[PDB]
Write a protein that binds this DNA or RNA. Sequence first.
DNA 1: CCGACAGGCGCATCAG
DNA 2: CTGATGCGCA
DNA 3: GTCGG
Length: 326
Amino acid sequence: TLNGGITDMLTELANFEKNVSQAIHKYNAYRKAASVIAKYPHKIKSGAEAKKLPGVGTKIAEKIDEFLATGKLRKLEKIRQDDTSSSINFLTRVSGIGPSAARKFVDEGIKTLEDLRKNEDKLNHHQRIGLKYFGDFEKRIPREEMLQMQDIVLNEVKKVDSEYIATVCGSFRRGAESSGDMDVLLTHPSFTSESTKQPKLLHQVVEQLQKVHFITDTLSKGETKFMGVCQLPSKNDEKEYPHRRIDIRLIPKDQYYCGVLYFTGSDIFNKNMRAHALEKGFTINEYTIRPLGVTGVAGEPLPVDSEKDIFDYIQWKYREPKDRSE
DNA sequence: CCGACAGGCGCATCAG
DNA sequence: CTGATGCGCA
DNA sequence: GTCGG
Ligand SMILES: Cc1cn([C@H]2C[C@H](O)[C@@H](COP(=O)(O)OP(=O)(O)OP(=O)(O)O)O2)c(=O)[nH]c1=O
Ligand SMILES: [Ca+2]
Ligand SMILES: [Ca+2]
Ligand SMILES: [Ca+2]
Ligand SMILES: [Ca+2]
Ligand SMILES: [Ca+2]
């Protein structure tokens, strides 16, 4: 809230570039700016003051100038009244409709929740589930409920095979008091970078979670990654809990820390960490950290036995999950 | 100035 | 059918 | 939209 007006403003423009301009690099640029301003511990008095931050430049500065003086932004007022823009922006709030489909729907006269709800035959499976649980997917998950979802998931995973480890990552592991969804990192000794000795390792976990009515829906599902919906059981004469987005990723056990670094986030922390490693001659994915030879070719994986080790290689002081939030 | 800008899984489509 | 490209999302 | 080489 310190520069809340400013970071709200920038985030809105970020969402505009992504969903309407389909300009993914302007999106990121505005998000980087937002991020850096949020962490800045003085009430910003001018654009010039903000320009001294990395990722804030000439044009965001002018925008901050206009906002400080008048309390709003002309470019945004216009965007707020452009019907098309607002309609394309709204439809992307549905899980499974990105900038492209949203623009296609709006060209065909589909602009509202009602339009969607009586054109189910035009949506793919994912888009349909997102529509179905549209309101639920935008409620946040209190940490108390995340703690119950974690208990179910670990216990059921345990029940399929005691050798599995499941770790709830995302904002939950960063200690947040509320979460947007649930991210589960799954490992098992039969799946490593060198061999897959059992098949259905992810499937059997999903199947067990569906069997106890915890996973209610499936958005997509391959061998290593599941994306879907889950729900806590409710007691008698109570309202049902909202349905919730759940992601489960099966990662090679020997690449656990690159993996858990990756799903712990935040999204911008990773982007800033991958972007900083690139500048120091490495590349990081969910799997490995590798060096970069002059040609742009990735060297062979470096040894890693902790989250901390990854931070060393790119000359960063270890930051606890709590301190990786935006 | 002007080239990247993080990286990859699953689903969907298109050319052959 | 592969293989390549784009989308939506993590 | 921003940066740094
Ligand atoms: C979406 C996204 C996720 N990630 C990583 C980091 C995230 O912690 C993880 C998935 O987390 P998410 O499920 O996106 O949740 P979150 O960490 O954003 O927190 P919230 O629930 O409050 O929205 O994957 C990226 O590196 N880049 C991205 O763009
Ligand atoms: Ca700057
Ligand atoms: Ca969406
Ligand atoms: Ca999450
Ligand atoms: Ca997620
Ligand atoms: Ca029900």
